[PDB]
Write a protein that binds this ligand. Structure first.
Ligand SMILES: Nc1ncnc2c1ncn2[C@@H]1O[C@H](COP(=O)(O)OP(=O)(O)OP(=O)(O)O)[C@@H](O)[C@H]1O
Ligand SMILES: Nc1ncnc2c1ncn2[C@@H]1O[C@H](COP(=O)(O)OP(=O)(O)OP(=O)(O)O)[C@@H](O)[C@H]1O
Ligand SMILES: [Mg+2]
Ligand SMILES: [Mg+2]
Lengths: 236, 236
RNA sequence: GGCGCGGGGUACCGGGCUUGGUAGCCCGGGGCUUCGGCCGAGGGCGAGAGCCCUCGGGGUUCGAUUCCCCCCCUGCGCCGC
RNA sequence: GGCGCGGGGUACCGGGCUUGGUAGCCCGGGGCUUCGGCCGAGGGCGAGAGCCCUCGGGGUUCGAUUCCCCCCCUGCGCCGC
């Protein structure tokens, strides 16, 4: 009963602290889970250069891809774009494992407060830019729907979230004659019409006649039935 | 000028703190270096089970293997067995990169002190068991020689260690007629001896005669020369 | 640290290869020396020129650098999680 | 969030397929009904039985569920590092 748990949300919301507690409790229920995020590797360098980013991503993924085979992974990343959550979902997909988006939610102002409280190690306007740029889980894709939405300002029940989750892990992942007779009578009708120069009124008649011929048949040998039809019109 | 820097030493010695400072200074010299160790992953789980160890090792290696292609790696592990340092050396080998063992050294008692000071989060007798089990760098293999031996009790010069290192990165990694005539005369001698029933004294003579025939030749046409020899003995 | 393997233990110093004939050849480095070439150490005898003895121990042998068992120096394999 | 694609916008509810003949068939689900079968909504007329009109907007058309342009509902693609 393994599954990829895809946290999501802006910085300051409390993903890491969440992860740790979720992990700890989950593990209290004898479940082997590892917590992975790009920061794990981002912060192994002694400084940040944009060029590290290519490596940090490829590495963090391989990590996740590799771990999921054997363990619950809790992905501790911001995951703001929906392609980001797809990219993760695809690893789960690859191994046919369940997943669970968890949208640690909080209003821009509690976020702005929380950054400030953290010494604004990130320009406040970047929380604000990450806000206006965040893709709401589920707003565009049904696969993207949050399995949960946690309010971080409020107290937080991990016994409950654990319960709910394992329950989820228990799922297996969610990843002619009548035609010929019909479409061939339509054709015969388009001939008789477009050939016998019927007027609108007799048009409607043969049309209804066809619908009524058809009702009788349902109540059966294609060719037989079509001469039958051709005949019916000749008469009428 | 990339290279794998293989720290080594017991727990309590100060590898991680060392790594950080070494990295920081190295990076001050505009060198892209990442610090990797199995603990990076060991401590992403919320608890320790022996079964995690298979995964932690395979993962930590792939990490190192992957990073070395682009960056200096500083391996922050205990690396107590010599096969352990080989296993690392082999990744460097694989990519033809230099390496540098760094033996953060300290006596068992400073180690015992340091553990105690860390609240003996590891049974003192396991530092002591890791001591009696540690393989001294270089004691068995020349490839295993320490490029450096740091004393942790003492102050510590990273400007110097940085200097020394990059200097090291600047290296490119360190990874018949006369016979026939000789061995064929030996044979002719073993015949003449084992056939002409020579006594020990005449044995020595033909032997010396051979060594003297040979000296003349050096001063040349195999077959020619060997009839020449066969002749020389017939006479003598 | 186990258990193993290679090279060396012959002679200017390294490295490699060949060999039951007292060793030999190849590559790199050094030395003496007309020319040709030549070469290390300890002990004994000799004014000297020179001569004897040895080259880690043991055995197969006329003869071991080579084959075999110990051992020392080197270098390396796997593994010791 | 860009730019796109599929399904639906006809009628018991879902899902799929076929089709210029007023729609049809397949699978899953529900309802009424002797038997055979039958079915959704709004408006107008009718005591009633029943009858007229409409099914998002527009055009090619006798005729559009189908072809074409808007739009709404669904579901999805790539990408937005
Ligand atoms: N419920 C809370 N109330 C107040 N402050 C909080 C709360 N949760 C987290 N924080 C603060 O937010 C800061 C970020 O820590 P944490 O790792 O929890 O954040 P995060 O949002 O997961 O980080 P990231 O930017 O990777 O998402 C911490 O300093 C922490 O004190
Ligand atoms: N020079 C030093 N003097 C005193 N204490 C030290 C010194 N260096 C490290 N320590 C202590 O040793 C403890 C271990 O920290 P550190 O990460 O430096 O150790 P470590 O030996 O690298 O860990 P590991 O067990 O992974 O080798 C730390 O709590 C630190 O305070
Ligand atoms: Mg964090
Ligand atoms: Mg440490």
């Amino acid at each position: 009963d393994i599954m990829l748990i895809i946290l999501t949300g802006l910085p300051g919301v409390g993903k890491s602290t969440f992860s740790k507690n979720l992990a700890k409790i989950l593990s209290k229920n004898n479940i082997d889970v590892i917590v992975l995020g790009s920061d794990l590797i981002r912060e192994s360098f002694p400084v940040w250069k944009e060029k590290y980013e290519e490596f940090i991503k490829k590495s963090t993924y391989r990590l996740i891809d590799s771990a999921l085979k054997n363990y619950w992974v809790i992905v501790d990343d911001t995951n703001y774009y929906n392609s980001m959550r797809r990219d993760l979902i695809n690893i789960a997909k690859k191994y046919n494992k369940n997943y669970a988006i968890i949208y640690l939610k909080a209003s821009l102002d509690v976020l702005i407060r929380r950054n400030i409280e953290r010494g604004e190690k990130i320009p406040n306007e970047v929380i604000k830019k990450m806000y206006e740029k965040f893709d709401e889980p589920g707003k565009k894709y049904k696969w993207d729907e949050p399995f949960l939405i946690i309010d971080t300002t409020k107290d937080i029940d991990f016994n409950e979230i654990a319960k709910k989750l394992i329950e989820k892990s228990k799922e297996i992942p969610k990843f002619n004659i009548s035609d010929k007779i019909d479409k061939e009578t339509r054709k015969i009708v388009s001939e008789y019409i477009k050939s016998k120069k019927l007027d609108k009124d007799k048009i409607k008649e043969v049309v209804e006649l066809r619908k009524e011929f058809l009702k009788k048949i349902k109540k059966v040998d294609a060719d037989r039935v079509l001469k039958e039809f051709k005949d019916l019109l000749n008469s009428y």
